[PDB]
Amino acid sequence: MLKEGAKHFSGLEEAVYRNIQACKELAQTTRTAYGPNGMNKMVINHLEKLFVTNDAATILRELEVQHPAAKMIVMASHMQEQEVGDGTNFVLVFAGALLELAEELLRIGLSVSEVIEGYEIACRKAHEILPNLVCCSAKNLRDIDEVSSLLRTSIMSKQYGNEVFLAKLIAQACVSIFPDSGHFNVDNIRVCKILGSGISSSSVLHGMVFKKETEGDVTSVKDAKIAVYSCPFDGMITETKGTVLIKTAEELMNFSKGEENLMDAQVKAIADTGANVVVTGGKVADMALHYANKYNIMLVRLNSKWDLRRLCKTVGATALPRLTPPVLEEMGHCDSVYLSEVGDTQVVVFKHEKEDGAISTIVLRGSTDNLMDDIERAVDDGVNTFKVLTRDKRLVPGGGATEIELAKQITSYGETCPGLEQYAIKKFAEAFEAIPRALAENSGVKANEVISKLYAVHQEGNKNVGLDIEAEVPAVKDMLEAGILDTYLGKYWAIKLATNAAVTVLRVDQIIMAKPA
């Protein structure tokens, strides 16, 4: 009319409407998950493979939204993902509940400043009262079952069928390096895929693990310096065709002898300079393997960009795809390279650990390539959850037993200070009842009776609804002796990010114009 060009429907009335409906429609395609349930969704983008996923991370990473209100939450989601391990749908659910509860306050007739102040006061009160429900704590991290229970509890959120063997494997792989005390890295654990048997035959192995065959000889010496290259066996001599049938044998024999002499001089110069082995990334030839066998030089076969990228980012060499024989400028720190036979396949093992910065690589195997993705996701999630950078994790009874207690505390605190700040406190307290409802609605029964039962027993804070049929209607179980706990700092960071996102959304809310060309 005066500013926009019939593109967006912004003005002095869309605030208490579209800015909330967009977030509601964005969050409605997410409440179907959140909990140990089988709600797989297929993802079709550019790979054209038709794969089903369960986590919301890969779902949000593929969906393209064209709205600022929906894009204001993916930033906080990525920030929470970069900060701690898990935690993604909680912030979205909290923001959606806060917006749905503030819509009524805005429709009644209240300013946004009072609502923002009340939300900030409620968030401060929740952050102050949070360090008070600490039950269990971490004792010694040098044991096995102490961390295995936490790993099983973290894996049970994703996979419900098999969760003991994977947790035990992750615990054995993490305890063989370094604990949380001192220094522990994350990018030192690799996951390899082996197409063979099922998942009931996995094992662990310390060091580098790569599925690369060997057509030469077993070189178990320490002077075998590595030498990575791009495509050394490509084509240094390009041969063309003269006639149609065949040419003279003299010229072909001369060219073959010249190429053989050139490659012999090349391998002699690359072996006499201080490099017994060579990493190739091209094709093979009969004379090539003949020279490799007669010169006692290990020759690989399988080539991959990820392998050379990892070798470059770990050692620190540089590939030299040149025709003329260069000089030795790829000296690294590896020396102990051994060969092993696993699953009738030749694998390499690197030994260079000096009791500092050790690496590990778990051996994974499955049926198809569409099943190891969930296993790798569970493994990396458990690895990220194991890292907490503190000796005492101060675990709290998660699953919804603390949300009701926090809501009751906020409700009891809000019924004291007078003024027009009680409505926002009551809304922030009532917004905490969105976790048990989504967990009860995604099972098979209703959620009102579950909430009434949880509010009718006692204010102990250790009661939550189970997963079996004998725990849906009563929902009276003690999760303290079962082993279901959550991260203390994770919930705090999630609540902080949700409050920040809600404040940012409620602040910037007027007219959305455009920019001139």
Partner: protein, 516 residues
């Protein structure tokens, strides 16, 4: 082609009312922010007046011309582009109503000029002086930060601004805003500010871990070719023979060896110990084999330096930039007191302080890696501009809507002359000055007429400058809280409003012609 009516004034009044209604919810600290996105999906948050008026797509040519005229008069004072379109729109509406009633624009213009003169006289007679100290500047910077940024991080920036102003200003001549560099970084936190009393160098050295406690250091700026590249070159033209280029490379290597030997002997002559250090700034690369031999004796050489860095170094210290490494007079070597190396991110920074004549303060700010850092920079720039404007004069009048009420009371009651034709314009000019308190009370969340009549009764009973409270809506005095303003800003705003309202009512007809 032929048009003899009054539709031009009608469409002008309509466009003015539309422009006033579009921008009217950005007044006061409790305003609403705005967002702009169109080019490749770039989210940009803003709330200022000139920044919004400069980056918008207005479909009306009259509104675009009005915005251009308003922005063209913003380079005079600090920030006066806001709170201006409302009074102009009110005056234009009053003029249109008086024209529809039956009058001439000449009498309206004369009355507007008389009212402007009376308001100028009242502002000149009502001014008061105040001793400039530290609390006044602190309060001014706090009010500026509250009007710009939210009421959260507005406490850690005002102190740094006041400290930088006190460290820069120490003479009698007016200060200049060209010796303060505002840099930005990338961190994980939000509230992170620093006030460095020295210079900042982005680049450092390729071989760290040698020394960092260099007290009295000597810095020499040059631009010779120490080690640009190991590739063979000639004169910008490829040849065929390799003997000539290899001989040129050998000669260049011999020249580099001679230069490093000369600088080594110079460092050995001008020093000879470990306390007297030397630092060299060069824009070309540095070979590690020569860097090791240089550091073995106790002289650091930096590579990849920007032009602004060496410019600030030669302007703050005072050194001659030559193109030779010969043994010359040490008069061009600048002195450095303290050198520190900060390791963060993917590049180590260098901080030099305790030098001669500390006339270079750096306000380092950090953000959570987004677009709010530019907003914080604009806010601190507006705060520095307001502080500079509040330090040039010595008279500061209170604000918070306590000057327009007295002006209207003086223009309505104590009339300068007795004339109905002049009063017809005086009343219209006085009734258009009460839009600021009404808009403030509407945006604060209260009524519009109740607070107005309350302030009127409080001013009629007492007689002091009564302000507007944005908390309870009760009339209070703005002379005891801490709300202040400027002096020439109000005069410039009144002059701009009068100039805009004068050259608008004289529009006769608008024809459709022109080719260029």
């Amino acid at each position: 082609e032929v048009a003899r009516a009054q539709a031009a004034l009608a469409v002008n009044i309509s466009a003015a009312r539309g422009l006033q209604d579009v921008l009217r919810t950005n007044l006061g600290p409790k305003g609403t922010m705005k967002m702009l996105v169109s080019g490749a999906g770039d989210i940009k948050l803003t709330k200022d007046g000139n920044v919004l008026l400069h980056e918008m797509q207005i479909q009306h040519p009259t509104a675009s011309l009005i915005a251009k005229v308003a922005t063209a008069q913003d380079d005079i004072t600090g920030d006066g582009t806001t709170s201006n379109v409302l009074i102009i729109g009110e005056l234009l509406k009053q003029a249109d109503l008086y024209i529809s009633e039956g009058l001439h624009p000449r009498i309206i213009t004369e009355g507007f000029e008389a009212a402007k003169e009376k308001a100028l006289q009242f502002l000149e007679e009502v001014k008061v002086s105040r001793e400039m100290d530290r609390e006044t500047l602190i309060d001014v910077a706090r009010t500026s930060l509250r009007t710009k940024v939210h009421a959260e991080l507005a406490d850690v920036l005002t102190e740094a601004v006041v400290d930088s102003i006190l460290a820069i200003k120490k003479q009698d001549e007016p200060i200049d805003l060209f010796m303060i560099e505002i840099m930005e970084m990338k961190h994980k936190s939000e509230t992170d500010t620093s006030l460095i009393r020295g210079l900042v160098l982005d680049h450092g050295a390729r071989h760290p871990d040698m020394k960092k406690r260099v007290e009295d250091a000597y810095i020499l700026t040059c631009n010779v070719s120490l080690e640009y590249e190991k590739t063979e070159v000639n004169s910008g033209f490829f040849y065929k023979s390799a003997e000539e280029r290899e001989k040129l490379v050998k000669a260049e290597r011999k020249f580099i060896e001679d230069r490093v030997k000369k600088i080594i002997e110079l460092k050995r002559k001008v020093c000879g110990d470990s306390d007297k250090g030397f630092v060299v700034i060069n824009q070309k690369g540095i070979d590690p084999f020569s860097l090791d031999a240089l550091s073995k004796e106790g002289i650091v050489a930096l590579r990849r330096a920007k032009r602004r860095n060496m410019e600030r170094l030669t302007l703050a210290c005072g050194g001659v930039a030559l193109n030779s490494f010969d043994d010359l007079s040490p008069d061009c070597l600048g002195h450095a007191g303290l050198v520190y190396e900060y390791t963060l991110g993917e590049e180590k920074f260098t901080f030099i302080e305790k030098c001669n004549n500390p006339r270079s303060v750096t306000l380092l700010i950090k953000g959570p890696n987004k677009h709010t850092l530019t907003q914080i920079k604009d806010a601190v720039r507006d705060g520095l501009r307001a502080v500079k404007n509040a330090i040039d004069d010595g008279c500061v009048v209170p604000g918070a809507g306590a000057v327009e009420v007295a002006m209207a009371e003086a223009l309505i009651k104590h009339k300068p002359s007795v004339k109905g034709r002049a009063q017809l314009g005086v009343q219209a000019f006085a009734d258009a000055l009460l839009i600021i308190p009404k808009v403030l009370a509407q945006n604060s969340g209260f009524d519009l007429q109740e607070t107005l009549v309350k302030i009127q009764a409080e001013h009629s009973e007492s007689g002091q400058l009564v302000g507007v409270d944005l908390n309870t809506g009760e009339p209070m005095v703005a002379a005891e809280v801490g709300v202040w303003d400027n002096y020439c800003v109000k005069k410039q705003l009144l002059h701009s409003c009068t100039v805009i309202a004068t050259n608008i009512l004289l529009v006769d007809e608008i024809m459709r012609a022109g080719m260029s």
